[PDB]
RNA sequence: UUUUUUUUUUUUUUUUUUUUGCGCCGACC
């Protein structure tokens, strides 16, 4: 509106890079939110080549 | 013409059968 005085550029960018792993984050509670952030650092997988 | 020292015997071989501690960081239940 008239009132405002910026935009955001990106919701989904306020949360880190393990958060953003998470599909579909506002649809789940926030302690499993933080859970699945916090295992998505223990997962294996190709890290490095 | 002159005194104040004492005396005796009993103990054996060439030598022998496994890192503790300190502190930090991450993480699980």
Same mark, same amino acid.
């Given at each position: 509106? #008239? #009132?405002?005085?910026? %935009? #955001?550029? !990106? @919701?989904?960018?306020?949360? &880190?890079?393990? =958060?953003?792993?998470?599909? $579909? @984050? #506002?649809?789940?509670? =926030?302690?499993?939110?933080? $859970? &699945?952030? &916090? !295992? =998505?650092?223990?997962?294996?997988? %190709? &890290?490095?080549?």
């Amino acid at each position: 509106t #008239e #009132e405002h005085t910026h %935009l #955001e550029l !990106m @919701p989904a960018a306020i949360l &880190g890079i393990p =958060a953003s792993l998470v599909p $579909y @984050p #506002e649809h789940n509670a =926030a302690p499993r939110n933080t $859970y &699945g952030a &916090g !295992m =998505a650092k223990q997962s294996l997988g %190709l &890290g490095w080549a």
